[PDB]
């Protein structure tokens, strides 16, 4: 389930001492000079919704400060949240209202409250909003095989390779325990105990071997692994042709593969992205970026977040993205981060962020 | 396998725009100012070694610039690598030497051929290599229960424990598809429910067998014996009074003196620590099987009382098996206990690094 902002109100949250930023549907900029305190804006809102996680509160509290205070008005399935959540010398608070009325009130419940709500932790809900800065130029960069693996971490395909890896150490190390106990096994009394002992330790390891194995084949690569990319895949490849009608590229049927590469179809030959031209490269990957956000959630995203998408790219490449942009009519809430100015002509609504000597302003024009 | 740092250069990391440290062994200090650009130093040589960990360039990169770059000099098993690792608007990029003669060029080679050499994942190697300021001070004020915690925090306890969760999240997944299937079947491929039902089955065989204290267990029959060994080693390097120490199965010291047993929280405060150390730098043994050859301390000081800091410092004096033990601090008293020193000073939003005594 995909979430829609509203609004949040934020107190000494790093340049933030005191600002309260209501944000539109459509497409809204926000816009202001570098270091200005426009990412703190979205950290603060994922403070809102998650909390600690045992981090240092000395990362989020105005400098000078020692309490902080988030409060976000978000939406999910047409319901109303308000979330607060606030830290005051040592002493941790949250609470959660659906509707104008009470809902959760503990740190513990509210968390709990949110996860149950958002259907995702808070990892592959992080992916299916927010785009990093110039992510969507890194990517255009990376090697081919590169953009496979990056399609797959944002799934969380590795996260169930490093648990085929950890498996693997525990395997091992009972096996290498079997080879220090079969050598065991080739004043009296204790040492036939301990012998008898070290045969039941035998039966006891060479059992759980097996299943560690088994489960251990599920986190690899054909097991779950193989299970989320066929699931996937399909929701993304779907995605994908809706783009391609939005961004209105000249191609009828894009696939995507398992491992997760982009073919477009086209009338002499299969390509890769990286056979596209420079805009259409850009726009695939918006495209695909775009998708696996809708993947990660199951259905379509209401709110995505692009942190200073333009980052990496020439002068000319920012203009096709800023005209790519004005193609999207699919997404509700579209929230560009950025310090050029030029892409404001793209939004419906602007927010001006100017640091006034350490101190984060927020002002609406445009 | 564990390494011996050699030398670093950095440009743009942070504060370092342009800085280059060269590591020697014995005893290393790196003294300088809070907020001089000290840690910076090795958040850097991490980052040579595995660079971007799953990560924002935003954070590594000096404010201004949009490139950086960092090169290092180490040594495993007496064969010298350089790994270089870049990041230029964008475009990423690392490679790998041996001996001089290239060896990985790609940045997924290098990663994998890193991992290769040193024989453990980023956590376990950064726990056998970094002692986070702070760890020792843990050590001498945190109850029992912390303690024996704290302990198998460490050894990994946490890494495993994400994976005990990914088991009950596929069986949630395997489980809500067994559920279409059953739809299916009412309202071939029949033997999809069969492989599913089955994964259930030895996932919650794992799950169980694995619990709350399923790792616990694992992690004292492949740590402890080695954490004892190792953390008697030190007992006598560091000249304590005791011809054994024992580690119970539950990660707690059992120093053993002529009265019988004692325990740590009875033993002399400037054994307290000393013993306190011993267990660290055991655990760091135990982590990578063998004696480590590089152990970093950061700020190894903070929170102890004039007398105590005193005490450790007099215990550094005391380290010889380590071959290079580097001291980060803002603590000039310590270049006494240093082979060399590396001095850093901030020189308006740019580290700067000198060689002096
Ligand atoms: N803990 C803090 N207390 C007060 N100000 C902080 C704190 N942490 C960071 N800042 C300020 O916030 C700025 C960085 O904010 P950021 O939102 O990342 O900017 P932008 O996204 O506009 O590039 C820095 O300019 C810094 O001075
Ligand atoms: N990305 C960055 N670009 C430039 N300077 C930075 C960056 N991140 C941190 N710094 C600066 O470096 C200092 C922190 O460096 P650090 O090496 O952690 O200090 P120390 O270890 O001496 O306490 C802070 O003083 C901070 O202003
Ligand atoms: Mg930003
Ligand atoms: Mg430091």
């Given at each position: 389930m995909s979430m829609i902002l509203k609004e949040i109100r934020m107190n000494n949250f790093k340049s933030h001492v005191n600002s309260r930023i209501k944000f539109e549907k459509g497409?809204?900029?926000?816009?202001?000079?570098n270091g200005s305190g426009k990412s703190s804006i979205f950290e603060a809102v994922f403070f809102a919704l998650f909390?600690?996680?045992?981090?240092?509160?000395?990362?989020?509290?105005?400098?000078?400060?020692?309490?902080?205070?988030?409060?976000?008005?978000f939406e999910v399935n047409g319901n109303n949240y308000k979330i607060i959540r606030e830290y005051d010398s040592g002493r941790g608070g949250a609470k959660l209202y659906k509707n104008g009325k009470p809902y959760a009130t503990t740190i513990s419940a509210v968390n709990k409250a949110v996860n149950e709500i958002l259907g995702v932790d808070?990892?592959?809900?992080?992916?299916?909003?927010?785009?990093?800065?110039?992510?969507?130029?890194?990517?255009?960069?990376?090697?081919?095989?590169?953009?496979?693996?990056?399609?797959?971490?944002?799934?969380?395909?590795?996260?169930?390779?490093?648990?085929?890896?950890?498996?693997?150490?525990?395997?091992?190390?009972?096996?290498?325990?079997?080879?220090?106990?079969?050598?065991?096994?080739?004043?009296?009394?204790?040492?036939?105990?301990?012998?008898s002992n070290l045969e039941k330790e035998k039966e006891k390891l060479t059992k759980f071997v097996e299943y560690l194995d088994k489960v251990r084949r599920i986190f690899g690569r054909?097991?779950?692994?193989?299970y989320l990319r066929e699931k996937y895949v399909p929701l993304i490849q779907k995605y994908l042709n809706e783009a391609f009608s939005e961004f209105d590229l000249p191609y009828s049927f894009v696939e995507?593969?398992?491992?997760?590469?982009v073919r477009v179809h086209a009338p002499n030959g299969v390509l890769t992205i990286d056979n596209?031209?420079?805009?259409?490269?850009i726009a695939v990957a918006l495209?695909?970026?775009?998708?696996?956000?809708?993947?990660?959630?199951?259905?379509?995203?209401?709110?995505?977040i692009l942190d200073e998408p333009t980052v990496y790219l020439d002068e000319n490449r920012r203009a096709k993205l800023a005209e790519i942009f004005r193609k999207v009519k699919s997404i509700p809430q579209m929230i560009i981060i950025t310090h050029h100015?030029?892409?404001?002509?793209?939004?419906?609504?602007?927010?001006n962020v100017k640091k006034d000597g350490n101190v984060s302003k927020v002002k609406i024009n445009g």
């Open positions: 497409i809204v900029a926000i816009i202001g000079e909390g600690a996680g045992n981090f240092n509160y000395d990362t989020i509290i105005t400098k000078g400060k020692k309490s902080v205070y988030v409060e976000l008005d808070r990892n592959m809900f992080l992916n299916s909003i927010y785009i990093k800065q110039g992510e969507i130029a890194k990517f255009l960069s990376l090697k081919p095989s590169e953009k496979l693996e990056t399609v797959a971490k944002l799934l969380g395909i590795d996260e169930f390779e490093k648990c085929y890896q950890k498996m693997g150490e525990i395997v091992k190390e009972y096996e290498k325990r079997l080879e220090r106990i079969e050598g065991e096994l080739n004043s009296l009394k204790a040492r036939l105990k301990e012998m054909n097991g779950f692994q193989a995507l593969t398992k491992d997760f590469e596209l031209s420079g805009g259409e490269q495209s695909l970026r775009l998708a696996i956000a809708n993947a990660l959630i199951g259905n379509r995203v209401e709110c995505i100015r030029e892409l404001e002509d793209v939004a419906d609504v602007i927010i």
